[PDB]
Design a protein around this ligand. Structure first.
Ligand SMILES: NC(=O)C1=CN([C@@H]2O[C@H](COP(=O)(O)OP(=O)(O)OC[C@H]3O[C@@H](n4cnc5c(N)ncnc54)[C@H](OP(=O)(O)O)[C@@H]3O)[C@@H](O)[C@H]2O)C=CC1
Ligand code: SF4
Ligand code: SF4
Ligand code: SF4
Lengths: 87, 106, 315, 55, 375, 147, 314, 149
């Protein structure tokens, strides 16, 4: 978004499952959270990013969601189990 | 001493009827310390601060001062107030003075 | 039969803290438009005992991490001193004629908060330790100014004995003489008792029920109860000390009939404070004191030292 | 409405009312209407010292 | 209680100062966008109420715009007047909730109860027109659902005339209450440019004095035809943001007047039956009506393939919908901008070295709602 | 003066006691937090029924579970449930956590609230109207009274 | 796949699961997703935590009484298998100590006959073999022999005290610290015992329903090592870290103690019956069908006592 | 000054009449359009309305509904096990809109909180019983509302 000329544009790219595209945090400033987002919602990696790590998930969990494949019901579930007294 | 004893025995009575009454099942993890859900990262250690003693000590040295202020009501009836009155003011000035010195040395 | 007199001092007051709780939810309710407790009463009246029964009936766990001895001894001390401070209080006739019981009121009040320190120390929890610590900060920070202004208002009654403080108020009331000190006494009672704007010990949203957390059923009831003991008690104290009344010895009861009004008139006000102001935060809480209250307490103090000489009006 | 607070508050008063009465009359009950006697100083106690023996 | 039920702000505090707050969102990531993809457009709409749930209408409006652009279709004007009207009542809802609970976090307690009476009277309106007290799936991609009942507008009038005393009395308990001032007046300032780098939105911008505002800037509805004063802040401290909240409440209260005074008769759903389901009296007595009814609910409408980013002035900030029709009746991807997300990202910069209570207040000036953050 | 008579009396006394002033703590996780608050809003005022929201489970008993649950969140929930004093209860609320409700099919939800804690009364809704909630808790008292 | 949603043919009826048994067995049923009909005698409240274990319609509490005949006809009425558990150690008044081990298993057995119940199963302590000390070994021997006489094809559990952290046993001697010392009749080899444990026993029971061969055979469940009682308690306070005081004692006085502590109206910490539970060692007979015959191998106590007793730790 | 001002303000709110309604004994205002418990309902003839066009299944976002129609012996279309589960239903009222014969209806009743999860999962018969309990009431709402539809 540009302010004084109040108008919006939308650049965009493409990426391999494995090629590490660089992080864009420095250029737009408020993109630190997003790098982490897309990293944990996808495989894609951003280079020169200070700290990719999981958000919007459980801890382990592993497989990225939003991979267009990957079942919405996922591969797992928690439940509390009295014999071990733990979820 | 009698009222002290009746008060303390009263309270202790409330304690004993507080524990030896519900008569139910304590067990582990129920008895684990509270930490807003998730378990503690470590037992309580060292919340260190100079900003504690830097003032709290000043508390202690004012409290010693007020300890000297207490005789005043009785001292007021002394036969020779002009001999007294300066001092009655004097300590207060220093009390203030002490504070003043702290006030502005940050 | 002095013992039955003591018992006669201790039962009615506990009843008073219970119904104090209920009044608290009531008035503090109507400030909020919403009615307070009501359905169980008929006028709510039966509530507090149902409440206390709900507590004591409920299981009071002994925490695994806590050392147990301190953890138990603290509540005991809380109710202990909360009640013990009541003894030398002229209504009109003190249960005890201490030569200097005011100073004793300060003594009890000063050992009070120490129980808070243990309450948060043995509780072992992070919130317990942090909240307890800041608690002790605000408390002491207010006891110094507390005791000084109480001194300055006591230079003129004559002496530390309490009954005389009636005699010295056979007309004008102390308050017209030195109200600003009455303000600072009021607020210092508003913080020492750990109340509305000076809210930190409970912490509440700031620290999820503060020091008091790990205590479960009964001990919690004890800290809660003792807290209200101190609130009504400093209120009564202010009442006798800044608001005099007519006293015919032949009909002492008349005086008491007046006195409970004049003190209740104070306690309600705390509640009507509670409904009104956001809490200070631990910086400003101590800022206004050390920076702002205190110097006036001193200047007023020298002033009150100096009136009796200039006015030749020594008590 | 707000007047309905009163049953809650009056119960307070009476409770607090009790000690103030209960002590003041017990004194008269024990002292025979003499309305107790303070003894802040050694001398006044000396008057209660001279007393009791005199009766 | 200050963590709003779903925050885990672990932090390495010193003696009592914070050294760095470390937010961990996702504690309520219900997983929305994956679900949306499997459900047709009309069946996706409720998720949006389930988003910024305090501000339930404006989200719906954001979506219905987001589709109408793809669908190239324009609501009959009356519908636009409702859409703005409830857009504004909702503006008041979020501001009430924001200023209030932000006060409750710092212990004011009372103003809360004084206001939720009113807020309940507003839910009487969602109650009345939508049939639900909240989460009123009422705004439609085609315009609006059922028409609103005749007995309503005077009722809104009677309330709106008297609300101002209430907001005013609130302001008497707060704005002068210098205790409240001292607690929130030097925190937590953000540089006006530095806001822009982090992409702060709505009030978090105006607090630092920058002029920008989407209703004046890139108006989307009858905002062309309403007149109201945007309240710029100055210092960028929580206090200015607060005054912005209040003043924007008053201004919305100005909008309600104008919308009440120019509320044209006409239809409310779009005529295009291919997108808007037929009225019941009609579908039960003519063939095409029943068929388009049937297909609108079975398969649902198709959208031309395409992509877009709409954004509107949701009370917390601009609310942003990026979606891509594949041409099928199930939208392919529907990334949802959450204004709160950026804010909460900017928080730790905004809150270094501040006292631990102040970080609690400053979470509140961020007026964040985690349901929106976790999407 | 049968012992059973006295037992009936004490039964009435403690069960009436506990049922007369229960003290909810609340996971107002999702969006059914707000409806909870309208129970405590003046117009319905939960407090007149004696119930009062007090934080910190150790000082509270019954637990409301408003709003959608999620995976990462669950263990904290089990923690809090364990740290409550007996006689603890809970209350599932809304279509939220009765069983995932709207979000029944996602990787992060944990279906019902039932699958981590032993729920008492259910209060179906989405959100339940605060009043339907009120009927909920009164029903809870009419269940304690049978204890 | 076996799982929480999985069906299985089981329709077990587990009396008295309210105690240390059989929340574990109901669990391992529950991970299978197998239906259960646990019926409560007590109060709903204590039963409440049983609820999660199931999957919506699975677990089904039913009101019953062990004394009414038809009351037990209720919960068996569609059960494919029924599994008795009932047994209070310290003799309640209204349930005289005998019927608990006699009548109830009896009605269970013959009703198991009439309802054509596919399998019946029952528990009795290894020392149930008749002995002058303790009326429980004998009364349980009587109901053992009775159900065997009434439902002969029933397999019968013989577990010499399962080991669990909650356990009413290990926790008990852990809690003997509270009085001061630990009452040993004469220390050392005065008696010697073994523990089956909670999970191993549970897995074994359900495996026993999983075993076609486990018909009328009387299964018995024994700990891997023959721990001496003195060194055992030594290990107890070795893990509880509490001070350890052996407390040698003439045998009669301990029974004077048990008679002293049976007095309490509630649930006494100790009883003369338990006093006879104390000093009598388990028999070492292995030839009976048992735990390993099921194919399950016992989990050693040595790695598992810690979790069991950490709550006692200072 | 302002302190005592605000304090005087809450004094002023003490004297206003309390807003609380006396629930249960009084109950809050609602609307004809309000949504609550579901209930299939009959023709005045006494015949049931539902005809298993099954699109109630096809439009519910939570997909709470499950239907399994089989022919009547008469040969009329009917359900065999219409069912629904309040555990997943979100009370959005799409079903209320969707039905061509206006069979299922989102009933005015809003209170049916219950002890056990298995009760939530309504069977067809349950819905009919709800339709029997309330029919004058529901027909009243729809009578008061349909013109706006
Ligand atoms: N280590 C061990 O504990 C060993 C145990 N065993 C045997 O296996 C069985 C399982 O042991 P465990 O579960 O720990 O014992 P518990 O006491 O824990 O289980 C017995 C349960 O059955 C209930 N019950 C039984 N009969 C009645 C009745 N007539 N009225 C009311 N309630 C009744 C009890 O009370 P309620 O349900 O009413 O609360 C209790 O809940 C026991 O019978 C025991 O003899 C064998 C070897 C070792
Ligand atoms: S109930 Fe309605 S609001 Fe509460 S979570 Fe489920 S959907 Fe969101
Ligand atoms: S619409 Fe109503 S009636 Fe027609 S099928 Fe779906 S449910 Fe049965
Ligand atoms: S209630 Fe709303 S959500 Fe549940 S089925 Fe009927 S329409 Fe679909």
């Amino acid at each position: 978004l540009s302010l004084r000329f109040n108008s919006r544009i939308r650049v965009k790219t493409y990426t391999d499952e494995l090629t590490p595209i660089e992080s864009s945090v420095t250029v737009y400033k408020a993109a630190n959270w997003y790098e982490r987002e897309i990293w944990d919602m996808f495989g894609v990696f951003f280079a020169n990013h200070p700290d990719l790590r999981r958000i919007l998930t459980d801890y382990g969990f592993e497989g990225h969601p939003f991979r267009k494949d990957f079942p919405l019901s996922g591969y797992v579930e928690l439940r509390y189990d009295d014999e071990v007294k733990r979820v | 001493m009698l009222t002290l004893l009746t008060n303390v025995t009263l309270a202790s009575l409330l304690v004993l009827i507080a524990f030896w009454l519900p008569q139910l099942n304590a067990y582990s993890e129920k008895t684990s310390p509270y930490e807003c859900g998730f378990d503690p990262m470590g037992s309580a250690r060292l919340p260190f601060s100079m900003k504690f003693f830097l003032v709290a000590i000043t508390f202690l040295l004012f409290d010693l001062e007020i300890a000297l202020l207490l005789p005043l009501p009785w001292a007021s009836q002394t036969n020779n107030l002009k001999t007294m009155l300066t001092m009655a003011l004097f300590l207060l000035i220093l009390l203030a003075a002490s504070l003043a010195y702290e006030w502005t040395q940050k | 039969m002095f013992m039955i007199n003591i018992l006669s001092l201790i039962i009615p007051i506990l009843l008073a803290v219970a119904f104090l709780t209920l009044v608290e939810r009531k008035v503090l309710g109507y400030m909020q438009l919403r009615k307070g407790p009501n359905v169980v009463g008929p006028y709510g009246l039966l509530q507090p005992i149902a409440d206390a029964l709900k507590l004591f009936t409920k299981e009071p766990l002994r925490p695994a991490t806590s050392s147990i001895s301190m953890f138990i001894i603290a509540p005991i001390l809380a109710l202990s001193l909360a009640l013990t401070m009541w003894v030398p209080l002229p209504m009109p006739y003190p249960l005890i004629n201490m030569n200097l019981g005011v100073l004793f009121m300060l003594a009890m009040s000063s050992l009070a908060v120490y129980s808070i320190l243990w309450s948060g120390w043995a509780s072992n929890s992070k919130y317990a330790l942090i909240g307890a610590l800041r608690a002790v900060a605000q408390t002491i920070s207010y006891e110094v100014t507390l005791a000084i202004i109480l001194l300055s208002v006591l230079l003129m009654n004559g002496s530390y004995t309490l009954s005389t403080l009636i005699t010295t108020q056979e007309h004008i009331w102390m308050i017209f003489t030195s109200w600003p000190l009455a303000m600072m006494w009021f607020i210092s009672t508003l913080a020492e008792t750990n109340r509305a704007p000076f809210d930190l010990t409970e912490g509440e949203s700031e620290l999820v029920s503060g020091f008091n957390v790990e205590y479960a059923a009964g001990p919690f009831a004890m800290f809660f109860m003792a807290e209200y003991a101190n609130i009504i008690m400093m209120n009564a104290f202010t009442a006798i000390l800044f608001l005099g009344a007519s006293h015919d010895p032949h009909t002492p009861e008349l005086y008491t009939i007046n006195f409970v009004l004049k003190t209740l008139a104070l306690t309600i006000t705390f509640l009507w404070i509670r409904a009104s102001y956001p809490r200070f935060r631990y910086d400003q809480l101590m800022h206004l004191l050390w920076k702002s209250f205190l110097p006036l307490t001193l200047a007023l103090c020298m002033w009150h030292i100096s009136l009796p000489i200039m006015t030749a009006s020594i008590p | 409405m707000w007047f309905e607070i009163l049953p809650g508050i009056a119960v307070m008063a009476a409770c607090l009312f009790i000690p103030g009465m209960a002590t003041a009359h017990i004194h008269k009950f024990t002292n025979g209407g003499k309305e107790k006697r303070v003894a802040h100083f050694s001398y006044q106690w000396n008057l209660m010292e001279r007393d009791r023996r005199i009766s | 209680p200050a963590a709003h039920g779903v925050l885990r702000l672990v932090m390495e505090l010193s003696g009592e100062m914070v050294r760095k707050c470390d937010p961990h969102i996702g504690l309520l990531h219900r997983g929305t966008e994956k679900l949306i993809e499997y459900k047709t457009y009309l069946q996706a709409l409720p998720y949006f109420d389930r988003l910024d749930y305090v501000s339930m209408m404006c989200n719906e409006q954001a979506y219905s715009l987001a589709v109408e652009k793809l669908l190239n279709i324009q609501p009959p004007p009356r519908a636009q007047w409702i859409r703005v009207l409830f857009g504004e009542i909702t503006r008041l809802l979020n501001h009430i909730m924001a200023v209030t609970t932000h006060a409750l976090d710092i212990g004011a307690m009372t103003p809360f109860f004084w206001m939720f009476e009113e807020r309940e009277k507003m839910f009487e309106f969602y109650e009345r027109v939508s049939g639900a007290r909240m989460h009123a799936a009422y705004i439609r991609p085609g315009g609006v659902h059922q028409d609103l009942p005749l007995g309503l507008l005077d009722d809104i009038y009677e309330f709106s005339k008297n609300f101002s005393f209430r907001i005013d009395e609130l302001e008497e308990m707060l704005t002068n209450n210098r205790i409240w001032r001292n607690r929130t007046v030097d925190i937590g300032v953000v540089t006006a440019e530095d806001a822009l780098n982090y992409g702060f939105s709505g009030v978090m911008l105006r607090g630092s004095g920058i002029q920008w505002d989407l209703r004046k800037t890139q108006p989307y509805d009858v905002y062309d035809q309403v007149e109201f004063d945007v309240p710029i802040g100055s210092r960028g401290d929580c206090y200015d943001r607060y005054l912005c909240r209040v003043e924007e409440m008053r201004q919305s209260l100005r909008i309600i007047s104008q919308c009440l005074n120019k509320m044209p008769p006409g239809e409310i759903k779009v005529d295009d039956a291919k997108v808007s389901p037929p009225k019941r009296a009609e579908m039960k007595t003519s063939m095409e009506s029943l068929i388009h009814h049937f297909k609108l609910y079975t398969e649902g409408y198709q959208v031309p393939p395409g992509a877009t980013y709409t954004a509107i002035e949701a009370p917390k900030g601009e609310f942003g919908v990026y979606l891509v029709s594949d041409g099928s009746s199930r939208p392919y991807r529907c990334k949802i901008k959450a204004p709160g997300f950026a804010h909460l990202a900017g928080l730790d910069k905004m809150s270094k070295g501040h006292m631990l209570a102040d970080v609690v207040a400053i979470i509140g000036t961020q007026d964040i709602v985690f349901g929106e953050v976790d999407r | 003066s049968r012992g059973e008579y006295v037992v009936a009396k004490l039964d009435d006394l403690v069960n009436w006691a506990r049922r007369s002033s229960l003290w909810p703590m609340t996971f107002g996780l999702a969006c059914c937090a707000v409806e909870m608050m309208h129970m405590a809003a003046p117009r319905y005022d939960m407090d007149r029924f004696g119930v009062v929201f007090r934080a910190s489970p150790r000082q509270s008993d019954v637990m409301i579970v408003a709003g959608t649950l999620t995976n990462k969140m669950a263990p904290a929930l089990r923690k809090v449930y364990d740290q409550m004093p007996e006689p603890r209860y809970v209350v599932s609320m809304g279509s939220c956590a009765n069983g995932g409700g709207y979000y029944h099919y996602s990787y992060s939800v944990v279906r019902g609230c039932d699958r981590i804690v032993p729920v008492d009364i259910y209060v179906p809704g989405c959100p339940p109207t605060a009043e339907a909630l009120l009927y909920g808790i009164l029903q809870l008292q009419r269940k304690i009274k049978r204890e | 796949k076996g799982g929480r949603s999985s069906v299985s043919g089981i329709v077990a009826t587990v009396f008295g699961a309210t105690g240390f048994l059989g929340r574990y067995v109901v669990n391992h049923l529950g991970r299978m997703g197998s239906q259960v009909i646990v019926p409560y005698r007590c109060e709903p409240y204590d039963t409440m935590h049983l609820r999660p274990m199931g999957d919506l319609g699975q677990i089904i509490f039913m009101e019953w009484n062990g004394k009414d005949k038809d009351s037990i006809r209720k919960v068996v009425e569609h059960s494919n298998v029924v599994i008795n558990l009932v047994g209070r150690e310290w003799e309640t008044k209204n349930f005289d100590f005998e019927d608990v081990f006699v009548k109830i298993p009896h009605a269970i057995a013959q009703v198991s006959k009439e309802a054509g119940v596919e399998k019946l199963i029952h528990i009795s302590h290894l020392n149930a073999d008749i002995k002058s000390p303790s009326r429980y070994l004998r009364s349980k021997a009587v109901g053992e022999k009775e159900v065997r006489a009434a439902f002969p094809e029933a397999t019968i559990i013989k577990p010499s005290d399962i080991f669990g952290r909650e356990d009413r046993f290990l926790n008990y001697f852990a809690s003997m610290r509270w009085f001061g010392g630990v009452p040993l009749i004469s220390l050392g080899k005065e008696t010697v015992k073994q523990p089956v444990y909670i999970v191993d026993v549970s897995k074994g029971i359900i495996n026993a329903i999983k075993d076609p061969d486990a018909k009328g055979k009387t299964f018995a469940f024994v700990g891997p090592n023959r721990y001496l009682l003195f060194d055992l308690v030594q290990y107890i306070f070795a893990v509880a870290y509490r001070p350890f005081l052996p407390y040698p004692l003439p045998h009669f006085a301990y029974r004077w103690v048990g008679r002293l502590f049976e007095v309490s109206p509630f649930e006494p910490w100790t009883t003369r019956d338990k006093v006879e539970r104390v000093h009598m060692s388990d028999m070492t007979l292995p030839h009976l069908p048992g735990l390993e015959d099921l194919g399950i191998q016992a989990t050693p106590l040595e790695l598992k006592a810690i979790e069991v007793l950490r709550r006692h730790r200072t | 000054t302002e302190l005592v001002r605000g304090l005087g303000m809450t004094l002023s709110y003490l004297f206003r009449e309390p807003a609380t309604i006396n629930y249960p004994f009084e109950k809050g205002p609602l609307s004809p359009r309000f949504r609550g418990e579901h209930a299939l309902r009959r023709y005045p003839s006494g015949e049931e309305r539902c005809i298993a066009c099954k699109l109630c299944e096809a439009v519910c976002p939570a997909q709470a509904i499950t239907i399994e129609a089989e022919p009547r012996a008469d040969g009329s279309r009917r359900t065999t096990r219409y069912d629904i589960d309040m555990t997943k239903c979100i009370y959005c009222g799409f079903c209320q809109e969707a039905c061509p014969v206006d069979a299922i209806v989102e009933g005015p009743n809003f209170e049916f909180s219950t002890e056990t999860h298995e009760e939530l999962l309504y069977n067809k018969e349950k819905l009919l019983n709800n339709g029997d309990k309330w029919e004058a009431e529901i027909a009243a709402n729809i009578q008061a509302d349909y013109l706006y539809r």
